Amino acid sequence: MQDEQKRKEIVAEYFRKVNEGDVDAIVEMFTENATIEDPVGKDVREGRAAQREYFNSNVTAEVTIEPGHLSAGQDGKSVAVALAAEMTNILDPNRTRVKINAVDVFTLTPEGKIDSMRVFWGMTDIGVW
Amino acid sequence: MQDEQKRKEIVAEYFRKVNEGDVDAIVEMFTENATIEDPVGKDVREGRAAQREYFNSNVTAEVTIEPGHLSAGQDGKSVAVALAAEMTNILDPNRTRVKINAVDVFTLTPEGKIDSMRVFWGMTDIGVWNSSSV
């Protein structure tokens, strides 16, 4: 959306749906050709198949997100927000929960669909206990 | 810097120097043709010059920054951080401060210098806060 408030509300709803773990509902928030860059500097994920794989991987990892303040850009489409993500590695037989402190930047269409997400987190943004 | 900890330590210094009000020292942390886009979307300063227009008006605005956690990109150069910036309230200079909740994204050089900064904040990211207990 181009209205800041409404734009933020769509991102808030995205995090609610990540938390709910409902892949189909999450994927439908994105445009069909939306790109996801997670982490920033690795391979860009592009289109529906890649989104699906990425969100299945997140729900499988039992991700929970606690978002910080949602900041709007003044470009009619961006939202940027620091978050704490917690998740489990499904290959770890101890299923140990890890925290990642990340920053997400979204851009949205004027109809309110997400068309890019970039996720900043590095090796040194990961914590345990 | 390509090493995440080093890259972060540099941005940590940037905020320290901003809070110190030392325009000389701040401007220097940038490269010659660094772009500062603040706010994102009403772009886009470029150049050693406009970085002094920039840093001088921050000092004039009595800006203080409280950064949160510094996250790194895995692109060998980005740092991204949510912060709270407080400054003078011109509508009520003496009684209140304006607070903006923003996200900064920096990209840095392999030497340690800032090439770009995009500061995300909107009209809905501004609060007014009590400033004195007179």
Residue numbers in the entry:
A (entry chain A): 1 to 129
B (entry chain B): 1 to 134
According to the publication:
Using this metabolite in vitro as a substrate analogue, SalBIII has been shown to form pyran ring A. We have determined the X-ray crystal structure of SalBIII, and structure-guided mutagenesis of putative active-site residues has identified Asp38 and Asp104 as an essential catalytic dyad. The demonstrated pyran synthase activity of SalBIII further extends the impressive catalytic versatility of α+β barrel fold proteins.
The most similar 3D structures to that of SalBIII are those of the MonB-type epoxide hydrolases, but sequence alignment shows that in SalBIII one of the two catalytic residues (Asp38 and Glu65 in Lsd19/LasB N-terminal domain) is missing, and overall its sequence diverges significantly from other members of this family. In contrast, alteration of either Asp38 or Asp104 (to either Ala or Asn) gave wholly inactive mutants. These residues are suitably placed in the active site to operate as a catalytic dyad, to accomplish both dehydration and oxa-conjugate addition. Superimposition of the modeled active site structure of Cyc11 and that of Lsd19/LasB C-terminal domain[10e] onto the active site of SalBIII shows that they occupy exactly equivalent positions.
